[PDB]
Amino acid sequence: DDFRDPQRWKECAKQGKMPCYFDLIEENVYLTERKKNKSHRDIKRMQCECTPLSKDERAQGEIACGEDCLNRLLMIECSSRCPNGDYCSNRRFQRKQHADVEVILTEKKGWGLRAAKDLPSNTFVLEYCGEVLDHKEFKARVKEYARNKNIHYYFMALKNDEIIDATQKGNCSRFMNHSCEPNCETQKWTVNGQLRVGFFTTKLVPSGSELTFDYQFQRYGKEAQKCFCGSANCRGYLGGENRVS
Amino acid sequence: KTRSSRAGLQFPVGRVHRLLRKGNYSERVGAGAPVYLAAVLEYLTAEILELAGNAARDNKKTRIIPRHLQLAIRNDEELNKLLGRVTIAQGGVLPNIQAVLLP
Amino acid sequence: ESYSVYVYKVLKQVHPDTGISSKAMGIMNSFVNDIFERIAGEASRLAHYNKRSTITSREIQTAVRLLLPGELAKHAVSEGTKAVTKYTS
């Protein structure tokens, strides 16, 4: 049903039944690339002390860097110099390891994601891929796009000077909806000295169930938006009448 | 040939002997003493550098910096006992994060 | 004066291809001066306690068996004995 092909198809600019009317991206792209990074100095040697199994793999071979892996507990992926080489299981973002998920329509609020098969807890779903904005263009993007009539806005505050924007291009995680009783959460993971956001299951998700996370949203614009999920204790309004940033 | 060659040592038996005599350790010093002491100091130097070179190679490095000496000395229980009251400049410490601190 | 050149020459036996930094050399230099004083000061006491007048190989040997831990002591004592054996030949 997804049918990711380079030829764009017939849709009324909503990306709902055919994700190829607009343009889509498979990983996070940058606008103002920095030569002032953490990677070459700080993360260079902070690898886990997990002894590499040298002959026990694929059969009676336990996975390298499981929940005993300190880097995993610290929300850091092992670097290219991990002692386990390419057998490390804590290099999921780097390996493009995703979960089986589908994009469907459920409520008048918009499109969403569902798990295609059985998923245990603490299972990595998808990376929040998008355009990384600077201090100057974020405040320009926000004031210029409101008058372009965009229905949804996909700005996420990553750091004091890193803001992800999935508005023009984004992977399949741009569709995960807000839930007050979610089954996934947004975790900050550091990969090779780069900060990245990943979705992880918080409970047992049955085959064919909708995937949602707690949107830790704020309202930056002059306009007011409301949520229609209404599970059991839905707040409904973004941030009250606040004026932050 | 020097006394070092007769002892089969790299260390300066001449200097050790001179320092034992000049350093007031006794009113006179036996000829076997500077040889035995030189061999001991040389041996501990080799044991220290063996372990520091290993620590460097275990980091895939080719040069022994102070940290490799600290890692070497602290990873062996006997040298750790001998040098347990010694601060090493630029040495740092072993990670040793306590289990009750990990989630 | 420093033991630096002999430390560097000793390093090439155990690790022929590795180098050592100036600070690390300063550490090895301090370490040799320290253990030298620990053994020589202990040998001085051993002689004085026995009212002897000279530091013999026996005094060094005991100052070592006292100062060094159990397994290291046996190795150091072996290298000291072997060195005096060759030197007396």
Binding site: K44 | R63, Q90 | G19, S21, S22, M25
Partner: peptide
């Protein structure tokens, strides 16, 4: 294929015998 910042090594030069 990947290497660390040389500044790490500049702060501590090799022993010079001369």
């Amino acid at each position: 294929a990947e290497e660390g910042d040389s500044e790490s090594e500049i702060e501590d030069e090799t022993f010079n015998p001369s």
